[PDB]
Design a binder for these strands. Structure first.
Lengths: 157, 136, 75
RNA sequence: CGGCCGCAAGGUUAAAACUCAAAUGAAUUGACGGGGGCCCGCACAAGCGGUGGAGCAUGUGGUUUAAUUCGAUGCAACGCG
RNA sequence: UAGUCCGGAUUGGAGUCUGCAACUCGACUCCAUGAAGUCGGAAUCGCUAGUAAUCGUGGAUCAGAAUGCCACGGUGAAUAC
RNA sequence: AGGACCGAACCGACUAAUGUCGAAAAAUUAGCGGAUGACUUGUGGCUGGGGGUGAAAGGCCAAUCAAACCGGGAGAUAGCUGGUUCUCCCCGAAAGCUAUUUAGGUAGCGCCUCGUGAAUUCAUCUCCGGGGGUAGAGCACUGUUUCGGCAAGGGGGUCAUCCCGACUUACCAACCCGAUGCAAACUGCGAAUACCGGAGAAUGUUAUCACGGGAGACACACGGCGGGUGCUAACGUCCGUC
RNA sequence: AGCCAGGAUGUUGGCUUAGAAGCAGCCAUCAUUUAAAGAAAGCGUAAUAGCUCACUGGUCGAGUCGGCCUGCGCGGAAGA
RNA sequence: GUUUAUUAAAAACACAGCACUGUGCAAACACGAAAGUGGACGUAUACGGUGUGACGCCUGCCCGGUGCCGGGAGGUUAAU
RNA sequence: UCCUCCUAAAGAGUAACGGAGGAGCACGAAGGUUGGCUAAUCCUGGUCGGACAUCAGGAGGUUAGUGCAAUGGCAUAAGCC
RNA sequence: GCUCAACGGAUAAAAGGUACUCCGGGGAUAACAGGCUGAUACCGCCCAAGAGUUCAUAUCGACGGCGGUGUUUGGCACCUCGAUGUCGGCUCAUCACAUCCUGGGGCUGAAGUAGGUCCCAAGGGUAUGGCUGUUCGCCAUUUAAAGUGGUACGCGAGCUG
RNA sequence: UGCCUGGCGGCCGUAGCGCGGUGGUCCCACCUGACCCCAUGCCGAACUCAGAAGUGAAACGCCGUAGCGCCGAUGGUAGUGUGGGGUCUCCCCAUGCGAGAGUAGGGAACUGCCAGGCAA
RNA sequence: GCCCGGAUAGCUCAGUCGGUAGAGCAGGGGAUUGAAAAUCCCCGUGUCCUUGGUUCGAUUCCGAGUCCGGGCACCA
RNA sequence: CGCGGGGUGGAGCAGCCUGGUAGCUCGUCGGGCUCAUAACCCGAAGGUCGUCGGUUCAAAUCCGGCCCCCGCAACCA
RNA sequence: CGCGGGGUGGAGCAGCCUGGUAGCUCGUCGGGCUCAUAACCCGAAGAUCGUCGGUUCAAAUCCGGCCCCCGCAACCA
């Protein structure tokens, strides 16, 4: 029910400075989820301007095998938006266990990417978010690797 | 609750259980749990044992069930007079005769396996034993 | 909702190998054609293999597809 | 409520608590009436040609947008400022 | 008498003029392209005279940018008991 | 005045106890209701058995009533029960099948007996000739099953996004391939026993078959074996077989 | 099998973590004086410290250790 | 008041009252093969049937089904 | 009532309110015969035509068909003209 | 010419009630008790993820497993059709112990008080009413406690009805 | 008398597939033409016919190869009739029969008759 | 006097486990009106009793001080 | 435990019975009349037919299970 | 099983009776008129006669078989 504001505010920009200049139309790609820290590598799509693909990655490398010349460099100016996989044992209110932590833990909860099937007692749950502060990322990983049903809860890439 | 996905005939004849097992060599994991007794494994017991054993090995190494219920044991609702047709497919079981492998496992220290099977077998009805894939 | 059933048709072999019979004698009451005619062995519509001549009885396996046959040994 | 009368329906006698600053009579000017009379106007009737269907122009609502500046929005806004 | 030599939208190409500038966003030209539409539901509009209707001419605004507005004559009814 | 009132005789009969092989085949005792009335009683009439009568309970009609009593059809009928009387001798069942307004009866057949009559007729074994598809087995087929390999196609994606199309996935995954089990209604296999047929020896008071007189029997129980059912429960139940 | 004593340190291993210094957690599984000592089997401290540990040598001194296979038993095992 | 004499006295029955409906007198109905009688030596303010059951306030909607009454044209219609 | 499969213990038969499905017809042709032919289903290519009409080829092999349920059977075909 | 389909076909042609009932049979065939059985019900036992702030096993313990009893709900018709007259109350009880109290212990996440729990132990003790026919149950008020069961769910040739 | 090849069998996957090679004098195939015999629910593709230049590709046959299919012991196991036993929801024993599967191995047929060709 | 607990945006309420202060209602905001309602689009909203100390995180630890709901106890 | 009936646009009902193609009423939506609303007038969309599986060339329909809903039964005990 | 009647435009349905040559109302459409519908009024819109043969110059007709329906009646195999 809580599932625009980012694209309306990423338009506020200042978030990327491409080869010495910002203000260029751009967007973080869905195949890397670039994070503020370890810079990036940018590619120029025909329309929709620059397509950042996070520094070092295959699809970005595939482009190198087509029009590598178009590819460009940039930084971050000023950890919004990312996904996290939390494959875990069964559930038993575990869906609450993720959320229980997340609640007033603050961070955005638009990553309704769960998938409970497999063969064994191991539901595959994923979560895209739009966490703000980089420090917040760390507290989550410590508070989410802990969970008993959880066997893995870290930066999906 | 391991069980057949879309059968052929619904209810099945009781059928006496006799003779020895078949797949008697742990042909997958390095270690397995052979069965000595001669009883029937309810789908519940099997799966329950699976979770039992899996609890120990965390999730490292690898497992393999060697059986499968596939025999629709039927009961009759309580307080009903005999006859009037065979009852209802209450639950499924796999006939198990002496010497039948059940849970092959590997990738984990032999000791951890030897400990897990203690538990899994502990939940099983039929008396069982541990085994290792002796070459050929 | 069941319990219904036909009424056995007394099928199966009626004459075994080595047996002697008269023409018109019925050797087999097969429903399909588990067998096939042989020398002196007529095949009625009911696939009731029978004797076309008095004599002995035998069960050949001749034929490329190992189909069994019945033949009246001309005894 | 009680009392009396009544077969009944009810009737007769007849309060209070509470509640508002009005309720009300007539008469006046208007407005209105699916009241009456008298009269007019493309009001209708009698006709001529139209929009509404079609594509396009233009304005408008709505929607969208980072902005779709602001105002106009029964008749008397909508090729309007 | 056909969607037809009707229709002209849309669209490609190639141009002209204005103006620092014509992609968003102009006008106009040429070649081609060539849709909806075969008189429009409910509903509803103007109009009695040189009006309706139909026809083209012009002007302010204006660098440019009218199918709008304003203005001008041409043609020219019906009907009102 | 009154189907008025309290109330004895009178009429009735609510309650309790006693009695309940009694004092009695419905009463005594203690109390009960009616008691001028649709009351009660004498005597004597009348109404009759599918009839009477009934303030209606199927109550009453001679201690009897959802059709009285007595006698007569009449030894009703009784697939039901009980019972069925002296003796010895010989043989000796079945509790199955099929059919039945049949299922605790009966009928024909199976088994029984007595009689006449017939062939190594028959049984046992060894040997020979036979079909089988069961136990077991197996997984080519029908289904089902686990893992692995390959993997279309399905989704996520990057790029493109009109469109084609190109890579990409620690995502789902058909098919075929390799290993792996399961089946009463699966079989590319397949016993023993079982059954039929042929021959030969041994032993068997013909043990065999046919015809004939008379039956009984058709409720079966248990135990082992092979199963169905049921909970691989029942001295359970339903068959085969001994 | 007992008892005497050693069981350290380089060092706070680095990262981590308000500290985690021998043991929350990833890595390590290097070397040192080596009789031996791993970046610790169990305990314990805010971290420390600290009691043990595997282990190493002393004394005595003969067997000793756990699995395996099976024979027969014990518990498991309460009724009117 | 009555009631199951001999397990039931009641809330059962009857009950006065109300309604329905039958019946014009050789009544209706019943007893009876019948004659004949009760009805009644009465005649609609009467007599039989039925439902209800003093009194008080009342007693609503349904004619499809069934039955009862009325209509008789038309189809169907027996012996003849 | 009748048919088919299993139970049914490799001959026949064999019970249960045991397990599973059917029939109470159809056809003058779907019968008889003579001659002839033999499929399913995927892959590829192909006007409209697309997961799938028809077509060509191939692999495949009777996984098809047999008026209807099942079983046995069927290419010498009983299958199809 | 028959769904004579109950399909070997009693008729050309036929549905009910009987607690007003009646007769001849059966424990061949039921209700209740018993008997076998123990699915179910009850009690106990194994494994033990987990809860228990730390720590599985102080105390509970899921997923599962094996039992034991013969109290329940049942299954089977072996006993009884020539009468087993069914629940509760009353009266009178007797046994088991899987113990409600009292007595003796261990452990306790037991300071003490008071409890939790398991082991031993059957000597004795082990309510009065309200409502309901109830047993039971809820409730009132007690008590050291107001046990669980068997005994034809004891007890009618003793009572009540 | 040896090799070819064709027809017809016996037998019927030890005989069948795949792979590699190979033959055209004859034989065979394909092949050529089709007024006519006959034929196509269209079509000489098939069928049918008249023929024969061409060829050995296809097909066919032979030869080699075992990558499979296929065959297949011995032993053991399962089962099992019969007689005993137990811990009798299953098995033990004596005992006669005795698998399926799998292994060693086998293995790319043999064969009779006739007819024509070559070599004798 | 001692012992035990309640205090959270304006109202009612969530919480919290020594770690980065929310839900609901009103309320305000914008459209519209003269201002409301209806309708339409937005939203905030708290010294966690105070306070220091253990506080990088105390709001969950700790009393000291507050009121608040129970309980015992001074019966001169 | 039992037998019978039903689940279809947002609501109520068809249509199923007897295989191919789902209609009615209100409601929702678009326009009109009105100062405005309703009413009224014009025009329009909207239903994977409970779910799964099956039978079939094809299933809302035929067949079976599952979940729901209602009915009738649960007597002698 | 026989007999008595009968399928006519889409159709309720006359014609028949007394051979050639076929009506009605509902189907729809439009105009009309319509505060706006309403209502109401006119023409158009409409089968070679239930199926196929005989006799006839010509077959609804007059008749034979024929499907379907409608009644009686033989429903004692």
């Amino acid at each position: 029910q809580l599932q625009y504001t980012p694209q309306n505010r990423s338009k506020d920009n200042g978030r990327v400075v491409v080869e010495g200049v910002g203000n260029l139309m751009h967007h973080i790609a869905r195949c890397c989820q670039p994070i503020p820290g370890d810079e990036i590598v940018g590619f120029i799509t025909q329309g929709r301007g620059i397509s950042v693909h996070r520094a070092d990655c295959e699809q970005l490398a595939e482009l190198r095998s087509h029009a590598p010349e178009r590819i460009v460099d940039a930084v971050w100016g000023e950890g919004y938006s990312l996904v996290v996989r939390v494959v875990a044992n069964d559930r038993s209110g575990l869906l609450r266990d993720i959320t229980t932590i997340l609640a007033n833990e603050k961070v955005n909860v638009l990553g309704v990417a769960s998938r409970s099937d497999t063969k064994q007692q191991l539901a595959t749950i994923d979560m895209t978010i739009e966490i703000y502060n980089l420090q917040v990322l760390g507290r989550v990983l410590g508070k989410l690797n802990q969970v008993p049903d959880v066997i893995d809860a870290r930066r999906l890439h | 609750m391991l069980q057949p996905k879309r059968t052929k005939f619904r209810k099945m004849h009781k059928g006496r259980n006799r003779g020895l097992a078949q797949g008697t060599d742990v042909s997958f994991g390095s270690f397995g749990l052979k069965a000595v007794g001669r009883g029937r494994l309810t789908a519940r017991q099997i799966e329950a044992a699976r979770r039992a054993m899996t609890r120990a090995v965390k999730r490292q190494g690898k497992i393999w069930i060697r059986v499968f219920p596939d025999k629709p044991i039927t009961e009759k609702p309580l307080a009903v007079r005999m006859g009037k047709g065979k009852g209802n497919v209450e639950y499924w079981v796999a006939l198990i005769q002496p010497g039948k492998v059940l849970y092959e496992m590997d990738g984990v220290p032999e000791e951890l396996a030897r400990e897990a099977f203690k538990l899994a077998a502990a939940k099983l009805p039929i008396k069982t034993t541990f085994v290792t894939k002796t070459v050929m | 909702r069941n319990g219904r059933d036909s009424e056995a048709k007394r099928l199966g072999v009626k004459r075994f190998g080595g047996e002697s019979v008269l023409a018109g004698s019925i050797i087999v009451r097969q429903r399909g054609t588990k067998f096939h005619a042989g020398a002196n062995v007529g095949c009625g519509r009911d696939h009731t293999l029978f004797a076309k001549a008095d004599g002995k009885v035998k069960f050949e396996v001749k034929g490329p597809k190992n189909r069994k046959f019945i033949s009246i040994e001309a005894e």
